[PDB]
Design a protein around this ligand. Sequence first.
Ligand code: FAD
Ligand code: FAD
Lengths: 523, 523
Amino acid sequence: TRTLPPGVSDERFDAALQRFRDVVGDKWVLSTADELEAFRDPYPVGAAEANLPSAVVSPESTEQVQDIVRIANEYGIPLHPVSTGKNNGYGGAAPRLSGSVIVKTGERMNRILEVNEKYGYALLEPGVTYFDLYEYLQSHDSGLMLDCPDLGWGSVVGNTLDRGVGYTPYGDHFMWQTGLEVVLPQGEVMRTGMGALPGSDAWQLFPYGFGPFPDGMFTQSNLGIVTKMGIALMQRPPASQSFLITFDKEEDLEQIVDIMLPLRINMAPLQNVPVLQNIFMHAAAVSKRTEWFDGDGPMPAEAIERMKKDLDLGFWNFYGTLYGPPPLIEMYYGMIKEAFGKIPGARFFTHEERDDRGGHVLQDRHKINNGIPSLDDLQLLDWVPNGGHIGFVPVSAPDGREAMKQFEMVRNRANEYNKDYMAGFTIGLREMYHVCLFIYDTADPEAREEILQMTKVLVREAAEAGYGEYRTHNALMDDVMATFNWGDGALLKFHEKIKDALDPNGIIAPGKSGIWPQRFRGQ
Amino acid sequence: TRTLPPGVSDERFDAALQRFRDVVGDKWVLSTADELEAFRDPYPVGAAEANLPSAVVSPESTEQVQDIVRIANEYGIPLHPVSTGKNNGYGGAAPRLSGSVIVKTGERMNRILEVNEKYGYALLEPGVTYFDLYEYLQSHDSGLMLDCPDLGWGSVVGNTLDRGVGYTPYGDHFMWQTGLEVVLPQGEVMRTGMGALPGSDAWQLFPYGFGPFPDGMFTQSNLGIVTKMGIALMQRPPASQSFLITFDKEEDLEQIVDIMLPLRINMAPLQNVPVLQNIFMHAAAVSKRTEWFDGDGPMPAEAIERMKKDLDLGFWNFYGTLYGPPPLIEMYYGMIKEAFGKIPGARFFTHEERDDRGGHVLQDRHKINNGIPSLDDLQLLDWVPNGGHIGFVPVSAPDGREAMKQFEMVRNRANEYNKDYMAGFTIGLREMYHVCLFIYDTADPEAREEILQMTKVLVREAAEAGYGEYRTHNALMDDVMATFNWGDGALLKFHEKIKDALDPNGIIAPGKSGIWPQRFRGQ
Ligand SMILES: *Cc1cc2c(cc1C)nc1c(=O)[nH]c(=O)nc-1n2C[C@H](O)[C@H](O)[C@H](O)COP(=O)(O)OP(=O)(O)OC[C@H]1O[C@@H](n2cnc3c(N)ncnc32)[C@H](O)[C@@H]1O
Ligand SMILES: *Cc1cc2c(cc1C)nc1c(=O)[nH]c(=O)nc-1n2C[C@H](O)[C@H](O)[C@H](O)COP(=O)(O)OP(=O)(O)OC[C@H]1O[C@@H](n2cnc3c(N)ncnc32)[C@H](O)[C@@H]1O
């Protein structure tokens, strides 16, 4: 069943493969069943085998990436660029279009090119993971801290370019991205910002450069392959304090949101990203599902109460962190206690005060909120056997009623599909995320098809209520982009015009974010 | 000499004009010499008549803007979109390409569509000036403050889309821009971000939306005409304190910069944009040049000393502002005094302590740094008769030696052209601006040609030392874009591919930021 790129003969592909090996070296071009097994989406969705790579090519230099791209152009081979290819929750390393060659840039392009203590930035290659970088910072006893997502094994660049987020004050990764080098779809190479001016020291100091500001167009994008990217790094504060706030009632959501907003909007006293997660989220962190209920299908209210009482946690649980000199920390912690204190049954705990099994999450958020990469959230996959996950994160105004409506909306449709409402609400500055995680048996084809359908429904429903996803799984890219159809799909038509201008042979990551080049449209 | 669009007959233009009048109304289409005089660059540069509009069209609705664009497409008429057309220092309202129709969106599209106290944003049309908006905020007794540039008569949208800056903590305008509506070059209309999702309340709450993030591409851009744009508005703090720091020695620059940086980089204790301006800048604010020296050509050192002694000001003068509860203000003001205090001859003054004639600037920066639009900087045009100005602002790393090198570099070449070094250094977060303003006789054709040459030289020289401009005058767009030529002009080739994809008839603002569509290239 040898996987072949669309409309490419066995012969031409053998030639191309040869030319690829000529570029990177025989060792670093894979093209057999056994070898290609490793790059399967590790959390598959759907019953069906979807996404299947024709080869993997691991280049070591920008110049190689250029050569590959030129070759792919000649032969009309689709390319799927990845950094680490651990985009887990959103489709791992599997290409939207079958028969694509995966370009694994991060396998060999994994250098920390520069870290600068004075101006507080780093310039990185795609292969640099959050662990790799944190190690460097500890090794060299830096005064800087990174900002990490939940799972630290991923690329810093990869994450940034999916507009991923973290929970320190530098939590909007794209905001702090400064400068990148990218290979455009026909093999040209380009630098943005002050990188475009030979000799400039400001590549990682000033993002915008001169003329139209393009970096954004390389996020959630198929307009190139990024080979280098800068990111600002905040200075480690003198001290920090994490804390939990347990709220008993499921109805506390309304007043929690409406109180969070005015504490966050001026980046004080809530200086990190406020995150509020439900009880099911805390159970999965520590226990298996069978511990609380052994029926297939939804949990009864008695289970929920047992989970609350045993772990000693509210239905909603809020986690914040404060940074600065201890006066300021105390001053702010007080303001926060006075603020949320006005909700019946609101208990408060610092990262000192809880070493019990319910305070596991608090210990974990203390690490994350301080730029310490973990893999703690993989423990949430032991909730059920063969556990995997899919992410769904609609965006809305930070209003209690609106939050309550989302809670009802999702949990409802979730129970219809016999799945647990593992959800949270977080707030950026003026915006609300409904961070839903759904855990499922990855070895059961039914379960996979069910999850796919469920999210597709959640997406359709959310969009009908005015809620769009900020990011989605490989499997729902087409669906999600269809929700952003104002002006009769004006946005996507724009994306398409640009896609076709930079990528006339339709080479790069066809379908990414729902954007297909001309030769794939009509399908 | 009736001005005509490139390659359009008197007849076709008369038809088009008719079709334009059909769209907007006879009153709002201008096309005679007397009428068109008003839209001349009010601060001309060069001896020669450059830039000359064939008509002005003032639409009232997005839908009209669409109709105009469709008409312009048919006839191949170039369009020059403006909001207010007070881009003074950078070419006013005059089109890069002669025979262009100016679209004055801000004449009639000047509504404040929404201001939202809870979430802290506004949604604006192009015609809303900083005065218009500030009035609204005072009228409605808002808890919000705007962030204004030096000259308040300009558009909020216009400014934002040139990546203009201000001096409050919300001083990076583009950063706070959230959502826009734009008419693309073939007349299509589009919304970015959560605006693209029908029903979403998050258009001004979350900038990025889904898929590639395009807003940046409409800054310093000729890729459309913006009809609506959102901007976040910071909450007015409880209280504020502005302050001056006079430094005697011209050599104090080195240590001033190296001390400013670490006070700014964590947005505290320097919470506004630190701005340091030289003595000549303060003289022009209050006096005429003849007052200090009556020779044509550079000022002698005795004059400079007289200016210092009379106004009671250093060669460099630093202006900051602090925001918050009075404890925090005092705590930060102290840290700042201790910090800069380590420089011989450094005196400190609050906005209370100086009502003399040297403290005029301090009074003005207190207004600006607090979101109070002025036109105070027009007083700098009385330095010489028929005064006008051109801006030149290179970007560099915030390093003392680097600053000192820029100071020497510019002042040197400035004196060769018999012009005064009206300059400042400011710092964003991790970046340095060399804010040079050059004032000149606008009624003297020699003076105009001299200024043009001078800046072109300053630009060439700066670029050779690794310094690019963040923004430039109409007259040097081609020159500046030529400095960003890494990878053999990779950046501009990219811009061109996109320009040609969205604008196949080459309609919108040909030449803006050096970006010409196919039909104008080879010239
Ligand atoms: C399973 C899971 C995942 C997860 C999470 C919690 C769980 C239980 N929590 C997250 C969180 O709090 N925040 C967040 O941002 N992500 C979170 N995730 C997801 C995931 O593990 C992380 O996002 C991770 O940082 C992303 O993985 P990685 O960094 O390995 O990404 P990639 O495959 O290389 O890149 C993803 C996409 O980006 C584009 N891309 C990547 N590299 C390039 C280059 N060089 N050029 C162009 N485009 C590039 C591609 O479209 C690629 O598919
Ligand atoms: C003379 C002067 C100018 C000045 C200044 C001090 C002096 C003495 N100080 C400034 C400062 O501190 N900060 C700053 O950002 N600007 C400063 N200036 C310059 C100027 O007065 C201001 O920048 C002003 O805000 C800009 O003028 P305006 O707001 O009137 O701009 P415009 O002509 O309408 O727009 C300029 C360009 O933007 C693009 N544009 C504008 N509208 C649109 C629409 N609707 N669609 C697409 N593009 C648009 C055009 O390219 C236009 O030429």
